[PDB]
Amino acid sequence: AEVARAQAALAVNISAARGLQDVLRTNLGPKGTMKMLVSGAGDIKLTKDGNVLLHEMQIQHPTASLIAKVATAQDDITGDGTTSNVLIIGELLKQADLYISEGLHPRIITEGFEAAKEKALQFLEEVKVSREMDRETLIDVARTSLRTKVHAELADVLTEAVVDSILAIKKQDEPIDLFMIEIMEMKHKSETDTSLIRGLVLDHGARHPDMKKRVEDAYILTCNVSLEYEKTEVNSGFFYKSAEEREKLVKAERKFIEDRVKKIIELKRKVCGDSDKGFVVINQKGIDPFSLDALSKEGIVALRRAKRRNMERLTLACGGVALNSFDDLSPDCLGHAGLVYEYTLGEEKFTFIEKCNNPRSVTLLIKGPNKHTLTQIKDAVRDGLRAVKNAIDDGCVVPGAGAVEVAMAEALIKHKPSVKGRAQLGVQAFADALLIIPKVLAQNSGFDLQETLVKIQAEHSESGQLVGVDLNTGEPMVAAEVGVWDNYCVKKQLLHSCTVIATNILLVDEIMR
Amino acid sequence: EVARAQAALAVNISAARGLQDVLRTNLGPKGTMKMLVSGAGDIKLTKDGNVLLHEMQIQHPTASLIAKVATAQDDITGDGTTSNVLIIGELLKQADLYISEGLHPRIITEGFEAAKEKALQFLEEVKVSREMDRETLIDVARTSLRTKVHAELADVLTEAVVDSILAIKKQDEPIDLFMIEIMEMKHKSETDTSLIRGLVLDHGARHPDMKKRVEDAYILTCNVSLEYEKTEVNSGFFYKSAEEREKLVKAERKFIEDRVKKIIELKRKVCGDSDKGFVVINQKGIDPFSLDALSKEGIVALRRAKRRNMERLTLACGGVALNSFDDLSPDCLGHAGLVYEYTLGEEKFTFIEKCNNPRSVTLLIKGPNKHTLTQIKDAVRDGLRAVKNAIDDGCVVPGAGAVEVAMAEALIKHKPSVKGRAQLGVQAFADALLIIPKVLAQNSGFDLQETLVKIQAEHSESGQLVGVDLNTGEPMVAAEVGVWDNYCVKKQLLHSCTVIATNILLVDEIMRAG
Amino acid sequence: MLKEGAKHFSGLEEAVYRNIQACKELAQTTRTAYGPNGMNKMVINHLEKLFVTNDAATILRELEVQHPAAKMIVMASHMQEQEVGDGTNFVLVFAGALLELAEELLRIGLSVSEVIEGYEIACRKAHEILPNLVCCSAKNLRDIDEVSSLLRTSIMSKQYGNEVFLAKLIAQACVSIFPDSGHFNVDNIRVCKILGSGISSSSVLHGMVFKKETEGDVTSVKDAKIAVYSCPFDGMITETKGTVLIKTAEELMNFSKGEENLMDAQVKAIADTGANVVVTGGKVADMALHYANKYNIMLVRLNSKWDLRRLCKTVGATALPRLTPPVLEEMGHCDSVYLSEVGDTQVVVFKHEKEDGAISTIVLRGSTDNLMDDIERAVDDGVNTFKVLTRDKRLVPGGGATEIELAKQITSYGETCPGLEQYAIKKFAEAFEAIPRALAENSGVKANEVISKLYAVHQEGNKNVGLDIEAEVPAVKDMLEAGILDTYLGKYWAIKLATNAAVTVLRVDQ
């Protein structure tokens, strides 16, 4: 129906966009703060992570959709930097406003952003320098990547743990983790903690007096459904709806049980000898008491409650292949894990598999009795594994904590274009957009936001130094000497995603109801 | 009842912002003429920044403040007051962006202080010496008049203004405070402005053609009355008896008779021939009877002249002003080399020109007696104050926002004091200046960014003060064209802008007062 | 606003839009005016009569506007009223038309200041091609047909029913006493209304006409110099009254004796001083009359304000209140004083014969004074068009026949120059087109048809249209050869002042 045209209509778009970024301005670095999000579903999500906050619920606007769409693109590739993204787009718009409001065209500002941006990708290629893929160098990047997502204390616990996860590749270098994601969550004494368990860990386990607690030569056969019913891969029906039905269901479970156990004891003997090596069976459903007695005595370790998600990972880790029935299977096709041991902590049982043949699965064990703690620590892990993952794949990494932002801004030097001045508006706006990253650290910390920034420009003038605002005191420093460096992937994908979004906002001069 | 902190700063910026709009369409020759009927309802035609603030009704404290500081600038230069407002507005705008993000007013102020010192030293570097020739005075004269009127009428006023300043060198003043007598003539066109060397008189004789060419003029300027009629007075009021009033009427008339007689004796003593004339200028009447007698002797006697005519005559002519006539030597009376009477319009103006010992020139503006003739009066006014500055300073720069881009470029690049505290105000100071050139482009219809990148680059390559060609709104070298600005114009926008800014910036409360 | 200072009623939106729409409303009274028309505009003002006009000067002064933009043009129109006659209407329609066209320019994205510049240019080119549109001119001013063709256009602009009689009449009664070559007087010609009789019965009389009846004897001497007094009689002594009738009976005897002896002296002082025609705006008593019969003085019973005014301008007279004997100082340039009845009413006739300072009177006879007020507009403009101060007045095609010629030249010329100026130059052509539009509206047909068919015939310099049936359908009439001519000077000031007025008002924003 109604239609807004011209610069009036463009105002409606940019003012909204600036306002979303203003709210989220509070986040970034560890001198930032968690934001409380409640959708329409209850539960307190306490997240400073921008990607989580955009998706679960956010202010309605047309630009609400755009800040999330670019958040979506960023997260999927790199999996860091979705807080970072928001603030530059905003500050770009601010600058663009001043000129249009003077009596200029949205479109000339837009073209100058494209010229401006292209010089800055090229700026990255110089400023970057190769740094090690050795463990301790990746600690210094991991410490920084965790800090832009979440608070200081939460960042510190996870540094060492996240590095050891991604290091246990086979020299398989990707930007993201695909199968080194395993979430195990626990309500425990320690309020916040993350534990490193290498190799794939199983959701719960069964234990018997006769069962072998420590097993040093585990031939895994992975099975699914079940000792309750023979010839199944999905569950059979039930009978109990009448009084008479109950008795029948239990009685014919004896036949079903009797057929199954036989398969397993005969396979154990081929592989292990009598009891001279150990045998592991994966029940993903109920384990009947009758079958727990026989398997346990025999030298067979039964495990109760595993997932379909464990099932995928287990196959890669042991070298075995999945079966969905409890039946005989050739020794060849069974996986080998060279250690299986069960640590029973709290009210859950974590059975580990260690000596993984092929490590592309690792497990982080999330402690947190409280709902409010669990949500903080757990959501930091995911954006954390993928952050460090970018650094190991990347051969070159860029200095961090606004080091590169201030350098690019000064080099891009005003009155370098002279073509029409259409390029001049853009290259000038883009300079001030980058310098948002100093500004928001400085806001979070003591002293005034521009007051710290002019000292960064000054120190930048002295060459041989990349200078930015610290994450942990909000003061000027040589970022490089402290060690605070950020992966290349964040910094490369930032530029492409920020320019496109904010370009489109100025192109919109007709918004239809 | 108080506006405190953010609320106090908010009030000032908002006002500056609406005002700025008005007085950009007065800026340079490409600005637009303005009239008031909003000041009092009557029709005024005015195109000066200070003047327009007085004529309106100003109640807003920020508008009023800008008008007060304006007053000082207007006296000295009379140009750059169209500009004062523009630089103030932008200067605030810059500050506002930083404050809103999170910045203190005081750090802004410090960097203004640093800004001001550097900016003033830049004037000293960049200034170009000029001569004191006519040609060079023509170009201060023409550009300043071009601000305050059209291009067409301004070129006519250019001639009048310049010959006066040359004549003022002869007196050896380094100032102007005389030769500023503006006299109006009755006409049917305004595209004439005439220069009259000596003085001009509002009214002439009531009897035409006494001797309307005086070869040798001996000017007695008097002011006692030679007409007081037949009215019955006593001390200038009615008295109780007829007779008592009458007795005085005889003696008063008798007094007048003797004074008219002294003109007859004076012509022989000073003159002696009719080969020389004799000039009388009386600011009070003279009988029709007395004019015929004087006229045949070869005396021109003027009636109903002003008190302003009298003071001017006494300076220029070397004349006297006396409350008596008597028999006086030509040593006391002033001399003028020429007298001519020029009748034009409905009122005839006796000129008394080529005075010996002048110190007053009259610039005689012809016009229809509309508001247009008042418009050239106030154009001519500030064009005299402009060429006064050229005599004051030694150095006149090419303008048209040429100076201002050069000064802004110098600030952006380095810290003038080398501290970050200064630096926050310094950005703000540099972009404030850019309003003056860019906006000449805006009026014309030429995009503002395009002229900034060009004008600034050409400075860098050359070292020329490249300016704006007003009409295209595209850059050109301001030197050749004649768009120039004095040392005093670019000094006084700078001083006014800083002082006015820092008292509004540093508000923290505005509380009402009875 | 944002300010509680800086007063404006114009600026922003209101300069661009509101000012133009106001100019447009004033100039609606002249898109029914100028040349062929049947429009009449009645305006009242509590003047105890109805005032009928189709002249811009009287419409404009009545009408007050509170905006400087609309108010300023009224002054430009008055300026053209002093220097020349008819075309006053043309000054206001032009400025007002140009300003409507201007606002459209502002809309597109063009700036104010170039548009302002392009008019000055167009005005200069239009005047430069203007004396090349002379097609006819006078050479003798004592020849009634060459003068009357000029006159005719002024009259036409009023009504299209009174063109023939009047245009002849003025030239017959003379406005050719002056050489009109350095010098012309227009306060030594008035238009004098005589109530009674028809308006084709409007007559020629030479020298000052005053309506008031003559009393006593009449003079025919050449020693007759005019003495003017507003009130020289009121009774030489005023009564007070103590019995609320008289104060009283023996006193009434003295009040009458003293009046008759003081009036004897006063009227004998007039007789002696060489004043042998006295104009009395007072009251003629029997005593005062009785004296003036003996001395031989022509006596003018009464005068009103209007009659006194023309004596002070023409004579070099003053009108003094009197009841104590005076003497000459009013003086006069009139030798002869005769007596002649115009309208069957006794009229006082002044005359002398000379070129400079010589007097004439276009005197009218009419049913009512209202009918005479419109006719008067036609006639006073016809005296003011005479003034050019040459005898070759360089007549250019009247009636709006020039207008299309100017428009064609200007639009082509516009194309040649580049930049933003040119659009203003084109608009400047279409502002002249205002005149052909107004003639079309009264004629009864649309604008499209007239402007196209005038253009179709190309360069002609004759084409204009009337109120007729010939004026509608083929939309072609000859107004070079109908003897519809106007003067070069009248069209010059009309176009000049109007361009100056349009530029100053387009500038405002305060």
From Swiss-Prot, chain A:
Report residues binding ATP.
Answer: G29, G81, T82, T83, A401, G402, D486, K491
Q: Which domain of life is it from?
A: Eukaryota
Q: N6-acetyllysine-modified residues are where?
A: K189, K277, K355, K367, K378
Q: Which residues bind Mg(2+)?
A: D80
Q: Which SUPFAM superfamilies match?
A: GroEL apical domain-like (SSF52029), GroEL equatorial domain-like (SSF48592), GroEL-intermediate domain like (SSF54849)
Q: Principal place where this protein is found?
A: cytoplasm
Cite the entry's keywords alphabetically. Answer: Acetylation, ATP-binding, Chaperone, Cytoplasm, Hydrolase, Isopeptide bond, Nucleotide-binding, Phosphoprotein, Ubl conjugation
In its UniProt record, which GO terms are filed under biological process? chaperone mediated protein folding independent of cofactor; chaperone-mediated protein folding; positive regulation of establishment of protein localization to telomere; positive regulation of protein localization to Cajal body; positive regulation of telomerase RNA localization to Cajal body; positive regulation of telomere maintenance via telomerase; protein folding; protein stabilization
What InterPro entries does the record point to? Chap_CCT_zeta, Chaperone_TCP-1, Chaperonin_TCP-1_CS, Cpn60/GroEL/TCP-1, GroEL-like_apical_dom_sf, GROEL-like_equatorial_sf, TCP-1-like_intermed_sf, TCP-1_chaperonin
Q: Which cell locations does it reside in?
A: Cytoplasm
Residue sites binding ADP per the record: G29, G81, T82, T83, S84, T148, K149, A401, D486
As recorded in UniProt, its EC number(s) are 3.6.1.-
Phosphoserine: modified positions: S195
Q: Where are the transmembrane segments?
A: none
**Quaternary data:** Component of the chaperonin-containing T-complex (TRiC), a hexadecamer composed of two identical back-to-back stacked rings enclosing a protein folding chamber. Each ring is made up of eight different subunits: TCP1/CCT1, CCT2, CCT3, CCT4, CCT5, CCT6A/CCT6, CCT7, CCT8. Interacts with PACRG.
What disease is mentioned for this protein?
A: De novo genetic variants in nearly every subunit of the TRiC complex, including CCT6A, have been found in individuals with a broad spectrum of brain malformations, and clinical phenotypes ranging from mild to severe epilepsy, developmental delay, intellectual disability, ataxia, and other features of cerebral malfunction.
The Swiss-Prot or TrEMBL record describes its family as follows: Belongs to the TCP-1 chaperonin family.
Q: What is this protein called?
A: T-complex protein 1 subunit zeta
Q: Which organism is it from?
A: Homo sapiens
From Swiss-Prot, chain B:
Cross-link (Glycyl lysine isopeptide (Lys-Gly) (interchain with G-Cter in SUMO2)) at residue(s)? K240
Q: What is this protein called?
A: T-complex protein 1 subunit zeta
Q: Which residues carry this modification: N6-acetyllysine?
A: K188, K276, K354, K366, K377
Residue positions where Phosphoserine is found in the record: S194
Q: Which PANTHER family match?
A: CHAPERONIN (PTHR11353)
Disorder noted? De novo genetic variants in nearly every subunit of the TRiC complex, including CCT6A, have been found in individuals with a broad spectrum of brain malformations, and clinical phenotypes ranging from mild to severe epilepsy, developmental delay, intellectual disability, ataxia, and other features of cerebral malfunction.
Query: Where on this chain does Mg(2+) bind?
Result: D79
Q: What is its EC number?
A: 3.6.1.-
What do the Gene Ontology cellular component annotations say?
Answer: chaperonin-containing T-complex; cytoplasm; cytosol; extracellular exosome; microtubule
Curated annotation (Swiss-Prot), chain C:
Return one Gene Ontology term, BP aspect: positive regulation of telomerase RNA localization to Cajal body
Has UniProt tagged this entry with the keyword Nucleotide-binding?
yes
| Complex and partners | Component of the chaperonin-containing T-complex (TRiC), a hexadecamer composed of two identical back-to-back stacked rings enclosing a protein folding chamber. Each ring is made up of eight different subunits: TCP1/CCT1, CCT2, CCT3, CCT4, CCT5, CCT6A/CCT6, CCT7, CCT8. Interacts with PACRG. Interacts with DNAAF4. Interacts with synaptic plasticity regulator PANTS.
Q: Where in the cell is it found?
A: Cytoplasm; Cytoplasm, Cytoskeleton, Microtubule organizing center, Centrosome; Cytoplasm, Cytoskeleton, Cilium basal body
Does the record's keyword annotation contain Cytoplasm? yes
UniProt-listed PROSITE patterns: TCP1_1, TCP1_2, TCP1_3
Function per UniProt: Component of the chaperonin-containing T-complex (TRiC), a molecular chaperone complex that assists the folding of actin, tubulin and other proteins upon ATP hydrolysis. The TRiC complex mediates the folding of WRAP53/TCAB1, thereby regulating telomere maintenance. As part of the TRiC complex may play a role in the assembly of BBSome, a complex involved in ciliogenesis regulating transports vesicles to the cilia.
Record family assignment: Belongs to the TCP-1 chaperonin family.
**What's the protein name?**
T-complex protein 1 subunit theta
List the source organism.
Homo sapiens (Human)
Q: Which UniProt keywords apply?
A: Acetylation, ATP-binding, Cell projection, Chaperone, Cilium, Cytoplasm, Cytoskeleton, Hydrolase, Isopeptide bond, Nucleotide-binding, Phosphoprotein, Ubl conjugation
- Point out residues bearing the modification Phosphoserine: S10, S149, S200, S256, S304
* Location, primary (coarse class): cytoplasm
CDD domains hit by this protein: TCP1_theta
Q: Which GO terms describe its molecular function?
A: ATP binding; ATP hydrolysis activity; ATP-dependent protein folding chaperone; cadherin binding; protein folding chaperone; unfolded protein binding
**Cross-link Glycyl lysine isopeptide (Lys-Gly) (interchain with G-Cter in SUMO2): where in chain:** K211, K241, K247
Question: What lineage does the source organism belong to?
Answer: Eukaryota, Metazoa, Chordata, Craniata, Vertebrata
